[PDB]
């Protein structure tokens, strides 16, 4: 049984956009922070420094300008940093125009999103499952290893820049990774035990996405008011939490984000709260473990995280065979979030059951399910590019 997003914590009905934006949204953001992801301890830190390390105006055979940027989270050269890779379509900037952007984290390093041999190899810890890794270190053989999730050339040909950062720059995806992370520097309390409401990897990954947006605001080649933040699976959990917390993001795409992302936790289908916390104890707050095999006690569910994107366009998508993510749970979260989008005059999927494969449904709140297993395919990206065409042609007032 789901909590109503349009009934406030004190029982009062939310009938208007101002009550939603200025009372209900903060209420919900604090519940997710305390009980699920942990508290984001600060937004933009003082002293952000942006250093363009490489700049090639004829990348991808002339189709793109490629930028690599060190985004340091403080002015001292000893503060932590992340490495941002950016491809911008030369066709747009040759017209004296700023390109809209797709921004998303990657799983195995910037050098894996494209075979482009001029990308810096990540100098960070790489997980064991990464293709062609030599003892947790990037290798030349890993180049383009994950390019099937990154149709860079097609995205650029449709008029969008592509920005990415390796999630492991922010928090290595391993159970001890928070100790080697922004979190270890940022909320570096004198103590050692992680506090019960301290953020984990998803919170730290999300914060990195907002810091990448800070960089895009300074880059004259891109329009930072037209940024679609996207992610696949665990990095899609991060894209949703980033897009919910930071309403600068123009559009939000959740590709098969599953448990603790778009899927309802109270459905108890596929991956559950207990299973995700037991396998990935660093992803959520320790407080989220209160709900292991007790999802009935959750004071929110993930439809309210989706509602936190409203009125900005939100795309939630599933893969038919990806039962672990609970595709029907992701769809029903979209349906339970729709009344908030409707409050703002937007439309969600028509229907009470999962649509047929490869038949997207909904207006600014959109869903599709595609055939096959978990992944981020050319078919997913085709639907996202049409979505962005419709809801990200926003360079006019
Ligand atoms: Mg800009
Ligand atoms: Mg589930």
Residue numbers in the entry: 35 to 431
Paper passage:
We also pursued a complex structure of a catalytic histidine mutant (H408A) with BnzGlcA. We determined the structure of the H408A variant in the absence of substrate and saw only minimal changes in the protein structure. Substitution of either the catalytic serine (Ser-267) or histidine (His-408) with alanine significantly compromised the OtCE15A turnover rate (kcat), reducing the rate by 17,000- and 1,700-fold, respectively. As for the S267A variant, despite several attempts, we were unable to trap the Michaelis complex with BnzGlcA in the H408A variant.
Glucuronyl esterases (GEs)4 are enzymes able to cleave ester linkages connecting lignin to glucuronoxylan in the plant cell wall. GEs belong to the α/β-hydrolase superfamily and possess a catalytic triad common with serine-type hydrolases. OtCE15A is an interesting member of CE15 and the α/β-hydrolase superfamily in that it features acidic residues at both the canonical and noncanonical positions (Glu-290 and Asp-356). Here, we have investigated by mutagenesis the residues involved in catalysis and carbohydrate binding in the enzyme OtCE15A and, furthermore, present a series of structures of OtCE15A with different ligands, including monosaccharides and, for the first time in CE15, di- and oligosaccharides.
